[PDB]
Every structure is written in C-alpha cells, then in structure tokens.
A and B are shown apart, each in its own frame.
With several copies, the nearest count.
Chain A
C-alpha cells in the first residue's frame, strides 16, 4: 500500500528539492522514511484524538501532533 507512493511522484518531490539525478535505490529508501514520518505523526494525532474521546481525527489533531514533532504547519488552525 505504501508502494502506492509511486516512483514518479517520489521523482517529482526530489525535483522540487533540486535533485537532478536519482539512484535506483532512492525509491525504496524514500518510502521507508516516508512511512516512519507518517507513523510518528499519525500516532501522535490519534493520541490527541483518543484523548478528546473522539473517533474522528481532526486537522487540529494533526497540527498539534505536527507541532510536537517540531514540524509546525501553518494553514489548518495554527
């Protein structure tokens, strides 16, 4: 399912990053990182969720989580 994050997109991401030449192994490497990122943040959000005794993760739950990871995001409530 993470495989869903296609080579082409990982390619685009790198491009905006200023990368000109990608190594074949860069793909499976990126997915791993991407997963660890989504796992650490999603886990945090859901904890905030579960705390508010809700069954719905709200954008604030992400924002708050993201702020705990030192990944402050602007545009969804703070």
Chain B
C-alpha cells in the first residue's frame, strides 16, 4: 500500500492528531467524532502550550536559569492577563506567589 503519513504531519502539527482523536472517542463526549475535530483540538492545545512555554522560558532566562521549572511557569502565567484569567482557579504546585506588597505596608 501507500506510505504511512500521520494526520499530525498532514496537519502540520506537533501534537498527536491520532491520540487526540482517540481520547475524544473513548472520552464519552458525543457519539460520533468528525475528522477535523481532533485536528482542530490538537492545534489549539499545541498553540496554548507554546504560548506559555515562550513566556515561561523567558522567565527562566530573566533568572539566569536555562531550565524552565514551576516557578517560571507561575510567573509566566500570573503575569499574562490572558493566561492568568484562563488558569485563574488552577494552582501550580511548587510555583510560589508573585512578588507583591501593598503600598500602605512600606515605611514612609
């Protein structure tokens, strides 16, 4: 037969179109799943993890570190309005809190 190309590659994505498609089926969401449902969902997940790794990896550089860790992921998220609102009720293990001190608390 023909050489096996992956839906991911057909889509120009890094995330697993095949795996996402299965998770959709086996996940009991709808009864039937369109072909471009896994392609679109992966693309979005791939876009989002890229938007936060870009921000996270910078937090990492700003700290002389070459290896992203949770702190970096926190500062990445909690500083970007968009991402913070999105994960506004999620808590990141080992991520700490953002350096912030009410003014009325500083010496005068």
Contacts and interface: CB of A to CB of B under 8 A. Distances in A.
Chain B interface bracket (under 10, 10 to 19, 20 to 34, 35 or more):
10 to 19
A34 to B, nearest CB: 16
B105 A20 contact: yes
Contacts of A75: 70, 92-94
Interface stretch (B16-24, B35-43, B96-104): B96-104
Contacts of B90: 72-74
13 contacts: A16-B96, A16-B97, A18-B100, A18-B102, A71-B89, A72-B90, A72-B91, A73-B90, A73-B91, A73-B93, A74-B90, A74-B91, A75-B94
Interface of B: 70, 89-94, 96-97, 100-102, 105
Interface of A: 16-18, 20, 70-76
